[PDB]
CSV table of C-alpha atoms in Angstrom, one decimal:
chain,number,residue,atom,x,y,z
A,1,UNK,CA,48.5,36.8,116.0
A,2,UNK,CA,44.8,35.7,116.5
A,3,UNK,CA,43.1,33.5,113.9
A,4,UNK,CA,41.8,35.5,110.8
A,5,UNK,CA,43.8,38.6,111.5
A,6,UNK,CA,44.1,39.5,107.7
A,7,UNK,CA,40.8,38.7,106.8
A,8,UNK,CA,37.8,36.9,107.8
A,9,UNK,CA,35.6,34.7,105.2
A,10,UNK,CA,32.3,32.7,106.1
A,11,UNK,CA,30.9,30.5,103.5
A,12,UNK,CA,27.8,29.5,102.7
A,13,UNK,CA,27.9,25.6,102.2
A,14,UNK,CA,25.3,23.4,100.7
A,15,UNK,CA,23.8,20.2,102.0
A,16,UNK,CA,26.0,18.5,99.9
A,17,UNK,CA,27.8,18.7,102.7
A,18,UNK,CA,30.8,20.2,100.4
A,19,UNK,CA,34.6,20.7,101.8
A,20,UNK,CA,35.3,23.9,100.2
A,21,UNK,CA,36.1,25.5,103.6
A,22,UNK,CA,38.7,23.4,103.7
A,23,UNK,CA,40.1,23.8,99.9
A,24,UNK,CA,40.2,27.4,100.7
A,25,UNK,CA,42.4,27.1,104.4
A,26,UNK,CA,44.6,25.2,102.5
A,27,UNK,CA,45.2,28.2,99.5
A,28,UNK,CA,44.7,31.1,101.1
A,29,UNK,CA,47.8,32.9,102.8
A,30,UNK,CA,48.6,32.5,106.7
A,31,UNK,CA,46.4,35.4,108.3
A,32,UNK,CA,43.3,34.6,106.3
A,33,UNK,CA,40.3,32.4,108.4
A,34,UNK,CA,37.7,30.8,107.3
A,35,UNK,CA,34.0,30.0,108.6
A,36,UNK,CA,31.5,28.1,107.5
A,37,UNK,CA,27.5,28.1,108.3
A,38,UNK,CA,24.8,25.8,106.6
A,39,UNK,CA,21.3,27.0,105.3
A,40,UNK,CA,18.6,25.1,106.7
A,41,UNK,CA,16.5,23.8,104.0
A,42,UNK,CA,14.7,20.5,104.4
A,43,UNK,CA,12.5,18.6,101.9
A,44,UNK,CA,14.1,21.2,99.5
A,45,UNK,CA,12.6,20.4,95.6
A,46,UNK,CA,12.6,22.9,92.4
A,47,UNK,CA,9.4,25.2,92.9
A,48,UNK,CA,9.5,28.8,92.7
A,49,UNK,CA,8.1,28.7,96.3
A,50,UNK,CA,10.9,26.3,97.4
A,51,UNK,CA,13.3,28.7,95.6
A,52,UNK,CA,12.0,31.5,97.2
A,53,UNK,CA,12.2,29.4,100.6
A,54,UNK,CA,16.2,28.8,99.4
A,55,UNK,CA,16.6,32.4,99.1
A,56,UNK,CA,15.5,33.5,102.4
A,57,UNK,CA,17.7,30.6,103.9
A,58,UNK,CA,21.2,31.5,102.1
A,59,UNK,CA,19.7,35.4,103.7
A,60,UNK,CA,19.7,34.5,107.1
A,61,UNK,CA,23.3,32.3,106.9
A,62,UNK,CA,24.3,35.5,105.4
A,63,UNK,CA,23.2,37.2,108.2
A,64,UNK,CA,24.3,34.6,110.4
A,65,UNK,CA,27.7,34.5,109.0
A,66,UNK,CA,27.6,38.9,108.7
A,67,UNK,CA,26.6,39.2,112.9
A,68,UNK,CA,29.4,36.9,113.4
A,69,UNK,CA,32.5,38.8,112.3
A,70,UNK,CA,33.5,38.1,109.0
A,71,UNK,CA,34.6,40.2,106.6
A,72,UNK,CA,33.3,38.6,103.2
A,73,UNK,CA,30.5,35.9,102.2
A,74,UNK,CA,31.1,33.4,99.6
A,75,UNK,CA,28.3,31.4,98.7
A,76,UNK,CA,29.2,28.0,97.5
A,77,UNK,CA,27.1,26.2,94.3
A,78,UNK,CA,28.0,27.0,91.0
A,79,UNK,CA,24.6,25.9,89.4
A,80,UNK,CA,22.3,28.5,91.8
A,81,UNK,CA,24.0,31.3,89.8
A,82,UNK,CA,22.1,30.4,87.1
A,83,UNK,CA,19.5,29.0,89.4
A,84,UNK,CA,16.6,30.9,87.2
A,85,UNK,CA,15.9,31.6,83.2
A,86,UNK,CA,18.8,33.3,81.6
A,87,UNK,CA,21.2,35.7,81.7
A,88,UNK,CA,23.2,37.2,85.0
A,89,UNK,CA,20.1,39.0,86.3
A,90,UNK,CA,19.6,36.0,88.7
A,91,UNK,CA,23.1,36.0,90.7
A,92,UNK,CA,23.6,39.7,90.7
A,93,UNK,CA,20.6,39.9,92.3
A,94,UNK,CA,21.1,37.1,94.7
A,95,UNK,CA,24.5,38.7,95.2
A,96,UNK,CA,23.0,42.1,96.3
A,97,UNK,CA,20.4,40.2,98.7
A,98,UNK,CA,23.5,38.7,100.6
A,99,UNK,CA,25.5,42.0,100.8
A,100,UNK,CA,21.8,43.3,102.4
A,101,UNK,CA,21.9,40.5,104.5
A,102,UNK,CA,24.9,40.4,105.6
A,103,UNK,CA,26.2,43.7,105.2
A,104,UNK,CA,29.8,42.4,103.4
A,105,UNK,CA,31.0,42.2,100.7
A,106,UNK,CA,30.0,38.7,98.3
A,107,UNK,CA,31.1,35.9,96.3
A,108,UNK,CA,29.0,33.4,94.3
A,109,UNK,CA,30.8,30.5,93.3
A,110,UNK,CA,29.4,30.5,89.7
A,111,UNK,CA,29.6,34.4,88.9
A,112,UNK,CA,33.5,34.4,89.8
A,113,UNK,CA,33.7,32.1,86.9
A,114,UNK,CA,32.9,34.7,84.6
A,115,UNK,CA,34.6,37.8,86.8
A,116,UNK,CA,38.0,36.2,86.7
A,117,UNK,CA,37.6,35.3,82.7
A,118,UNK,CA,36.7,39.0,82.4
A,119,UNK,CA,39.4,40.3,85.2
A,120,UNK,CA,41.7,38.5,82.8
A,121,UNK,CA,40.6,39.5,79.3
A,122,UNK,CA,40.0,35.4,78.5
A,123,UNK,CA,37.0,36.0,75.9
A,124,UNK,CA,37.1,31.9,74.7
A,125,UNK,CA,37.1,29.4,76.6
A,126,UNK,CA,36.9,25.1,76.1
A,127,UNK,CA,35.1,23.4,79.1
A,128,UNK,CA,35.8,20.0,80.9
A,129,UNK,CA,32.5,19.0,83.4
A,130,UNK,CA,32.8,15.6,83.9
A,131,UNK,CA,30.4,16.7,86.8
A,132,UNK,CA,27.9,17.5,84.8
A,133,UNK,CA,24.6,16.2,82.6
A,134,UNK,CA,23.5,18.0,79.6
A,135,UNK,CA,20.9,19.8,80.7
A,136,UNK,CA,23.3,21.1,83.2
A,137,UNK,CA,26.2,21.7,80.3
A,138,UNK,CA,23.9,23.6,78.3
A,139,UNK,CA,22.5,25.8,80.8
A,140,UNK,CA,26.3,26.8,82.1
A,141,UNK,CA,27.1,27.6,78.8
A,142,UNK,CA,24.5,29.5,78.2
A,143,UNK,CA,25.7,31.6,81.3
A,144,UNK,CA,29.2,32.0,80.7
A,145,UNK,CA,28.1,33.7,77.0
A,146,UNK,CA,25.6,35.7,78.7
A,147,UNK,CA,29.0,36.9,80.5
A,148,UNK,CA,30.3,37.7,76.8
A,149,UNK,CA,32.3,34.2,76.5
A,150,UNK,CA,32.5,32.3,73.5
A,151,UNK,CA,32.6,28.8,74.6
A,152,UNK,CA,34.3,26.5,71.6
A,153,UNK,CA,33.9,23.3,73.0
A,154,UNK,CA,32.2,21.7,76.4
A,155,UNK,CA,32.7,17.8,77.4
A,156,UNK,CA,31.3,15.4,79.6
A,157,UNK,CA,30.7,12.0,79.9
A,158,UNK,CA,39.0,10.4,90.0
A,159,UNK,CA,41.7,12.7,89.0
A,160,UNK,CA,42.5,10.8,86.3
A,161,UNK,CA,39.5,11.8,84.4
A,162,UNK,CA,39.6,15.6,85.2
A,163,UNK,CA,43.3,15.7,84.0
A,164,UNK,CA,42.7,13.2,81.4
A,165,UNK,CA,39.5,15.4,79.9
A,166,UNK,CA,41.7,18.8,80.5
A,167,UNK,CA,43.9,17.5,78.3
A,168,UNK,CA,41.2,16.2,75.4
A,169,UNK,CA,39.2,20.0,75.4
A,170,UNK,CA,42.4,21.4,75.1
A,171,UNK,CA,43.9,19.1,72.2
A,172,UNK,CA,40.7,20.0,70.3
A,173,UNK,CA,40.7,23.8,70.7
A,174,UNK,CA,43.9,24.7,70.7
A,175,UNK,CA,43.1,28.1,70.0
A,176,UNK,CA,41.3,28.5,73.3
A,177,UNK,CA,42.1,31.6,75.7
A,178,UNK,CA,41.5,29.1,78.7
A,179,UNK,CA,39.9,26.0,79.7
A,180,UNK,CA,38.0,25.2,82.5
A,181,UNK,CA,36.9,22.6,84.9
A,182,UNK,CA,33.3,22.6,85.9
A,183,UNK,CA,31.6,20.7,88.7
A,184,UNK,CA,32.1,22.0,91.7
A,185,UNK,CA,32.2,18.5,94.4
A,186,UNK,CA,35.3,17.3,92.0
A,187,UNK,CA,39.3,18.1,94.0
A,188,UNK,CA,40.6,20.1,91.5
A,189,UNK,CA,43.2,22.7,93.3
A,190,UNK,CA,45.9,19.8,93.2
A,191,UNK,CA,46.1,19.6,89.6
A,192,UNK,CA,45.9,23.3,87.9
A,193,UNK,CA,49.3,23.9,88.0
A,194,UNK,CA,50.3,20.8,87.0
A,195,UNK,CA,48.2,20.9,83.8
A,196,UNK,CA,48.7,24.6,83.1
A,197,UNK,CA,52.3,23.8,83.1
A,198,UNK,CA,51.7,20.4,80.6
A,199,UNK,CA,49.3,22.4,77.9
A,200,UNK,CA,51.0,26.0,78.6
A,201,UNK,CA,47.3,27.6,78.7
A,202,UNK,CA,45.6,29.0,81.9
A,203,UNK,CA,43.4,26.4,83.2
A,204,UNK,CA,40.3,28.0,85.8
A,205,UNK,CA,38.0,25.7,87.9
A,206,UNK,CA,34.7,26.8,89.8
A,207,UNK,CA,37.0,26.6,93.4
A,208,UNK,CA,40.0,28.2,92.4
A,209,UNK,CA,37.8,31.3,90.5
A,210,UNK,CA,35.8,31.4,93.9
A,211,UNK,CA,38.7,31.7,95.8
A,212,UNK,CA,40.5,34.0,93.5
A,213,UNK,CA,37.3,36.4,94.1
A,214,UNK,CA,37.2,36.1,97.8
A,215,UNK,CA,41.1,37.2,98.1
A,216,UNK,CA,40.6,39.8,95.8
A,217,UNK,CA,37.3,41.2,98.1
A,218,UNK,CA,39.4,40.6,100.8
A,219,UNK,CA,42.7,42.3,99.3
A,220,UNK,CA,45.1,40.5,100.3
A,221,UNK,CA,47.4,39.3,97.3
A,222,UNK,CA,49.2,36.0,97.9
A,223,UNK,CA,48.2,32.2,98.5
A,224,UNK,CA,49.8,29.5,99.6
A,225,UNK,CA,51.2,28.2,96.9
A,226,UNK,CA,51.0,26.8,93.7
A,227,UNK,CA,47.7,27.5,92.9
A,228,UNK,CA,47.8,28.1,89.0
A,229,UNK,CA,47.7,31.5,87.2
A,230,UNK,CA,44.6,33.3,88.1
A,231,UNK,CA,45.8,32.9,92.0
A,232,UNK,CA,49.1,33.7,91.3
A,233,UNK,CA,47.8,37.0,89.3
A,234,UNK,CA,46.2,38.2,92.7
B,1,UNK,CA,38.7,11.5,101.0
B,2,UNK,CA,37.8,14.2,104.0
B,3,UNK,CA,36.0,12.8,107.0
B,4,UNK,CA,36.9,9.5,106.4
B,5,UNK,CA,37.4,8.9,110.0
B,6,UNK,CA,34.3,10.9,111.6
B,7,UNK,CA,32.5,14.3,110.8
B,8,UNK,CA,31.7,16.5,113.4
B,9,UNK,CA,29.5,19.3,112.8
B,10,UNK,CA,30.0,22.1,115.7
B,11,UNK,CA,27.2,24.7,116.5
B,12,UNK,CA,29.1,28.0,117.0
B,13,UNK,CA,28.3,30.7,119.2
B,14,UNK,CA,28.2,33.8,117.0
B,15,UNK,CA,31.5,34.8,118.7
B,16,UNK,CA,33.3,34.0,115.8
B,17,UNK,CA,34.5,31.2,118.1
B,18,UNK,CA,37.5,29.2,116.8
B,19,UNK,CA,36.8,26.4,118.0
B,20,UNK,CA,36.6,24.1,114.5
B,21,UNK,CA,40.2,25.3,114.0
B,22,UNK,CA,41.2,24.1,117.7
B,23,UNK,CA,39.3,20.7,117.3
B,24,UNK,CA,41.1,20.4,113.5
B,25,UNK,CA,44.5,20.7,115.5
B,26,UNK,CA,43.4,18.2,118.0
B,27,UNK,CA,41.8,15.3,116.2
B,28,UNK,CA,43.7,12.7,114.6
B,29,UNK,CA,44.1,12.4,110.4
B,30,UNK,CA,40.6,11.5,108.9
B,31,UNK,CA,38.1,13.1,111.1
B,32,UNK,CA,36.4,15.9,109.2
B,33,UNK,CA,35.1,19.2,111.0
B,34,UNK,CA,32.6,21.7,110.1
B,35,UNK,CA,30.5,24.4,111.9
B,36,UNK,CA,27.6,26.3,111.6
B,37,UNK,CA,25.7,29.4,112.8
B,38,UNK,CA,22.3,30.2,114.7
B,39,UNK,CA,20.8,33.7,114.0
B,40,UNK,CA,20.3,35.1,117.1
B,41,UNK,CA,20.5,38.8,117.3
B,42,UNK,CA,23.2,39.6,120.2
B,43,UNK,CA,20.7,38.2,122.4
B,44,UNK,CA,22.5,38.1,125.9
B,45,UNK,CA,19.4,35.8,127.4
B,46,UNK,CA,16.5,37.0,128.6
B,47,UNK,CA,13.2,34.6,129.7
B,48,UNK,CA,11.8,36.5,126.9
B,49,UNK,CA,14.6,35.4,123.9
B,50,UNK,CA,16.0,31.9,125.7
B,51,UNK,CA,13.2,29.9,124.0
B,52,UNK,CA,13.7,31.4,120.4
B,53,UNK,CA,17.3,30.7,121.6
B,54,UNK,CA,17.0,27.1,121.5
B,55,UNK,CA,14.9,26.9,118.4
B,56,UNK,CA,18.1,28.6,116.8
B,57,UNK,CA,20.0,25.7,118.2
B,58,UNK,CA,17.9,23.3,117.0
B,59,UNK,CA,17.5,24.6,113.4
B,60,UNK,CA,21.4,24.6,113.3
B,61,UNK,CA,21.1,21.2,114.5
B,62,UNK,CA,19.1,19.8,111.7
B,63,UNK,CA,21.0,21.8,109.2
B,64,UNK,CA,24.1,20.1,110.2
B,65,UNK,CA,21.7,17.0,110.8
B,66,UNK,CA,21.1,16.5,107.1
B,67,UNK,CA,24.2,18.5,105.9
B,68,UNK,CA,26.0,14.9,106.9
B,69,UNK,CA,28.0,14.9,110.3
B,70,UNK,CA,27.9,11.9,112.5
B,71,UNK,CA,28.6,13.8,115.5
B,72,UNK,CA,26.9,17.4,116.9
B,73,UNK,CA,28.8,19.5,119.4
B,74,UNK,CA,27.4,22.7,120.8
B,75,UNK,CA,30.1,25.0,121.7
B,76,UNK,CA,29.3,27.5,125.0
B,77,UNK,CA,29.9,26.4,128.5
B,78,UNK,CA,27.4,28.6,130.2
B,79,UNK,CA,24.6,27.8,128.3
B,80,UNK,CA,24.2,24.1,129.9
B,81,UNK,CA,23.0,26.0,133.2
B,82,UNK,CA,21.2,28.8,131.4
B,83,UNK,CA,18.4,27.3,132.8
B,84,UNK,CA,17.7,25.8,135.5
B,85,UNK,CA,18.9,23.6,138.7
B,86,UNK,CA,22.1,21.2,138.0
B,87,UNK,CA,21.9,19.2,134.8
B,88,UNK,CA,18.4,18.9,133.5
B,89,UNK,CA,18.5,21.9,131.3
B,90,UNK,CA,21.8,20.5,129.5
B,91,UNK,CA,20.1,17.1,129.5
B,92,UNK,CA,17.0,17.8,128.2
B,93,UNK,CA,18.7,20.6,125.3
B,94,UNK,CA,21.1,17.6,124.8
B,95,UNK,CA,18.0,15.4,123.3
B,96,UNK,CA,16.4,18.3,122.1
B,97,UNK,CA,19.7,18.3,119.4
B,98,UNK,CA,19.7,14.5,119.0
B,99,UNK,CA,16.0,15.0,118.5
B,100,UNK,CA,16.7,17.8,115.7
B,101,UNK,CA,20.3,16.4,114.2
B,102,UNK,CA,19.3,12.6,114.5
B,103,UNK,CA,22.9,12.6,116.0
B,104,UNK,CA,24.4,12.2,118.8
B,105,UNK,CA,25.2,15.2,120.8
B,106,UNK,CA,27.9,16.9,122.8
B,107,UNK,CA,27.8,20.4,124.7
B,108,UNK,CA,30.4,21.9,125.9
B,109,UNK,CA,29.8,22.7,129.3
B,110,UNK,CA,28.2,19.1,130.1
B,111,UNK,CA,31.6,17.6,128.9
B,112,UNK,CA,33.3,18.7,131.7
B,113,UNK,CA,31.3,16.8,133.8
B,114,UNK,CA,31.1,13.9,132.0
B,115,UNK,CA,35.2,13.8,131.8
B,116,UNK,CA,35.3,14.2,135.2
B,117,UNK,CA,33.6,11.7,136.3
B,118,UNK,CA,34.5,9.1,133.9
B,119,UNK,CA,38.5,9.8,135.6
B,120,UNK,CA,36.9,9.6,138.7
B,121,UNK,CA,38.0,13.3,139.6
B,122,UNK,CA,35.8,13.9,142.7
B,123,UNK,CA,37.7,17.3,143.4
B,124,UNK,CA,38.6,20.4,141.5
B,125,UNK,CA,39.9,23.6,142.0
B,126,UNK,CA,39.0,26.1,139.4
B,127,UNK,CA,40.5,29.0,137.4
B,128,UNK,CA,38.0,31.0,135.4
B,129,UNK,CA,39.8,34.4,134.1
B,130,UNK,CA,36.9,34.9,131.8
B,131,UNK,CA,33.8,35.0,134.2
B,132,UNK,CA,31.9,37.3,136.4
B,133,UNK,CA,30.9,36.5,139.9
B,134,UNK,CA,27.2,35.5,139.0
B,135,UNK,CA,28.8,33.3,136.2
B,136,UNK,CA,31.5,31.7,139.0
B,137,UNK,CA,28.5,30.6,141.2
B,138,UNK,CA,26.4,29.4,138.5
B,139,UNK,CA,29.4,27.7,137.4
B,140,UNK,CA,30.3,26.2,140.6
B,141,UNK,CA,26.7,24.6,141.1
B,142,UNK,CA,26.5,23.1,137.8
B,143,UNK,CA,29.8,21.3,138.7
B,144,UNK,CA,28.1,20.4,142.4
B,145,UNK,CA,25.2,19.1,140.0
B,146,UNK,CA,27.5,16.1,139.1
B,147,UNK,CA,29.0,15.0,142.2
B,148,UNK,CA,32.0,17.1,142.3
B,149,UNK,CA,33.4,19.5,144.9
B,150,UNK,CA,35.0,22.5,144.4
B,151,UNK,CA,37.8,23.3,146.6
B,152,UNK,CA,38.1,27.0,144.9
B,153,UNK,CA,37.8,29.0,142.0
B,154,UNK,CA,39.9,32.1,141.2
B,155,UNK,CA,38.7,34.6,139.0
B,156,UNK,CA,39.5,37.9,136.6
B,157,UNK,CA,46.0,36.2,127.9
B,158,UNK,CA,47.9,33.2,128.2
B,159,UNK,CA,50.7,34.4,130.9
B,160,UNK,CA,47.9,34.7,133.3
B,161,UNK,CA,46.2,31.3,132.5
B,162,UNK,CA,49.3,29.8,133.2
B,163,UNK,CA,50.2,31.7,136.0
B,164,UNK,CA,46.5,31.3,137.6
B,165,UNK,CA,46.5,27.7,136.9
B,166,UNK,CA,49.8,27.5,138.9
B,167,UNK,CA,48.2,29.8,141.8
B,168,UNK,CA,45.1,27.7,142.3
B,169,UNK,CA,47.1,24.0,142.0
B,170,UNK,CA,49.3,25.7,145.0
B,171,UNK,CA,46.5,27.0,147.0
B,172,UNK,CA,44.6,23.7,146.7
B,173,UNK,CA,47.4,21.0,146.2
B,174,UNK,CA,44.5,18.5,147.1
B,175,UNK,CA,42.6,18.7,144.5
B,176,UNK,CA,42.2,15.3,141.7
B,177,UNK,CA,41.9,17.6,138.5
B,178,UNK,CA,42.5,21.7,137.7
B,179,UNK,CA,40.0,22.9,135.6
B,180,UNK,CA,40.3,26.2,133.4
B,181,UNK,CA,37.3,28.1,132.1
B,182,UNK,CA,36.3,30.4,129.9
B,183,UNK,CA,36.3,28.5,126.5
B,184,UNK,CA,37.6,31.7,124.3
B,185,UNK,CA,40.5,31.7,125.9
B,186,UNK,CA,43.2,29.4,123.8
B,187,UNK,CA,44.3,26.8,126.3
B,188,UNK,CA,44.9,23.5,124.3
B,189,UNK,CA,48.5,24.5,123.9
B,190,UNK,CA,49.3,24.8,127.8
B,191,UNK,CA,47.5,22.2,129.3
B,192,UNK,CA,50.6,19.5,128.8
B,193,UNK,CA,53.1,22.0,130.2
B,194,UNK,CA,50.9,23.0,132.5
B,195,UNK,CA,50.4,18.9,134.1
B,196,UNK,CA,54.0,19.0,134.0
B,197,UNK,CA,54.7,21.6,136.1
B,198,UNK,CA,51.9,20.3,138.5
B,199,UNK,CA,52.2,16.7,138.6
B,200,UNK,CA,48.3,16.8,138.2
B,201,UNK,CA,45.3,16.3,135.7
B,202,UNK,CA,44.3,20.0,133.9
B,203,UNK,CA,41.0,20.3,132.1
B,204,UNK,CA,39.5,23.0,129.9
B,205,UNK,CA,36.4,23.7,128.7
B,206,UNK,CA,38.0,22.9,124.8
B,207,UNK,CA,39.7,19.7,125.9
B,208,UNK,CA,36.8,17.9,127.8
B,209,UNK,CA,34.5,19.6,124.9
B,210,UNK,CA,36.8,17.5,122.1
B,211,UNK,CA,37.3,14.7,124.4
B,212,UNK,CA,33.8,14.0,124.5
B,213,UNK,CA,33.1,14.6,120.5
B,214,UNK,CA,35.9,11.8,119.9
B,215,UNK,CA,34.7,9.8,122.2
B,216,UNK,CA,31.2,10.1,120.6
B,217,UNK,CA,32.8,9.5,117.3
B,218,UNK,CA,34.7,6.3,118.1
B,219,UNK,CA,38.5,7.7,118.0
B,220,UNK,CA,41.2,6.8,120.4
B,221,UNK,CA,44.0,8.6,119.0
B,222,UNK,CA,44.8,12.8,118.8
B,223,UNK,CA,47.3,14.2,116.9
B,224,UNK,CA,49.5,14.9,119.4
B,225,UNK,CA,50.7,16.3,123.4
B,226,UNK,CA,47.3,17.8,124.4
B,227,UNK,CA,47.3,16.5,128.3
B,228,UNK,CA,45.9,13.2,129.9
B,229,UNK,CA,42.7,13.5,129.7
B,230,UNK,CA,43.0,13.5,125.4
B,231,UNK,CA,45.8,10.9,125.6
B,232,UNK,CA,43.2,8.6,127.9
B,233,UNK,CA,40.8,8.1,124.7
């Protein structure tokens, strides 16, 4: 058995210098490897031209990541989804430049949001991102009903505050087909379960719906472990 | 909080190397690894593509540069005497990375020299499944290019590392240090069985490679029973 024999994943990862690589080696199955690359993308501001400079970056990691081996891209970043005007036009058309690119199959953090709420027939959600400012909050849910979502609440202002905030969204929409965590540099994995066994409703965060999409491109249908629902539907 | 301890960013050959998951076995709780990829098209080098080469490296560099890593490692042995007489290619691509990361640096290939001689090992004797004759040679030279004789190498999975280790340690029982090579071989697991069974020092191309990144980094402890030369930080 070498490394990655059932399935090979590169991710995209931002500056932020973000640790979803290793979120992901620690749910996915044995059998599954992951690989990370970083876009070069220096004195990076929000101009078209430095867009279109963004986009040609996340092309070549693609491609980076595609002659290497892998079997599936994820890009990480839920925001660069909806990185332009409205609507999903943006990030399917982002996604279809990185399966060019790369010539696999592709995962945007901030579309598998939406795909998994659709895969599972959740049509209202209530939203916890601390993460967020309300510009931000606005713009997200703008996306997720462009998606067909009604959103009945969002929030905003440790662990203790994600769980804490879970728990608020959901006392005040009970009603709610699932709730979700937004902000993507927050450590949410740990405390799905625990919270979607405390409220009894799913509970869906950018990582684990990322994650979720890149097993299900990759087909293989178990995690580690106690993930919450969505993984466990795999 | 990941990384606490040290990040290391590692510059991947587009082998699909597994290196990051070797080093992550290695290195003690709290030091944080990540890895990145140059685009170079399956350009087995050339004078017309080494150049473009190292500006891959280089951008790769930066990106993990500003991405956040204290620490750069370039992983590929023969590419420190890709060019070049002895050590002044891997010396000058060395600052060419700290010049391009703002970090320090460590490459592969060059770490084996460096462990060496900070042990003191002024003899070796070589086992190389992985290479080719002109790679041997070119091999062999660098390792003359720091001050250390080669007794022999033996050339052409992990039954014959072991068994080829054994074979050179008893055709050149004089020898301070054994040295495996070929990087993409998986050799971190027998290197303490292997100084066992010998009574003597055993060196890959992985273990002076992570040697020398925790050693950059500040670290004095590994996880673990990977050989002397890791249990010396």
């Amino acid at each position: 058995a070498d490394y990655g024999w059932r399935g090979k994943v590169g991710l995209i990862s931002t500056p932020v210098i973000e640790n979803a690589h290793v979120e992901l080696a620690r749910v996915a199955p044995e059998g599954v490897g992951v690989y990370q690359t970083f876009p070069y993308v220096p004195n990076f501001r929000v101009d078209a031209t430095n867009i279109k400079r963004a986009v040609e970056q996340l092309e070549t990691s693609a491609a980076a990541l595609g002659s290497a081996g892998v079997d599936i891209v994820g890009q990480v970043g839920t925001p660069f989804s909806f990185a332009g005007g409205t609507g999903l036009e943006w990030a399917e058309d982002i996604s279809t430049k990185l399966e060019k690119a790369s010539g696999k199959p592709v995962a945007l953090m901030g579309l598998s949001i939406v795909e998994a709420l659709q895969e599972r027939g959740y049509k209202t959600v209530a939203i916890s991102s601390t993460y967020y400012s309300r510009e931000l909050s606005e713009r997200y849910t703008q996306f997720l009903e462009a998606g067909g979502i009604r959103v009945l609440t969002i929030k905003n202002w440790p662990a203790s505050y994600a769980y804490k905030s879970a728990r608020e969204v959901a006392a005040e929409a009970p009603e709610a087909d699932c709730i979700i965590m937004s902000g993507a540099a927050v450590h949410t994995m740990d405390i799905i379960a625990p919270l979607e066994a405390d409220l009894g409703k799913p509970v869906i965060s950018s990582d684990s719906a990322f994650f979720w999409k890149i097993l299900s491109l990759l087909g293989v249908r178990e995690t580690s472990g106690g993930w919450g629902s969505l993984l466990d539907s795999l």
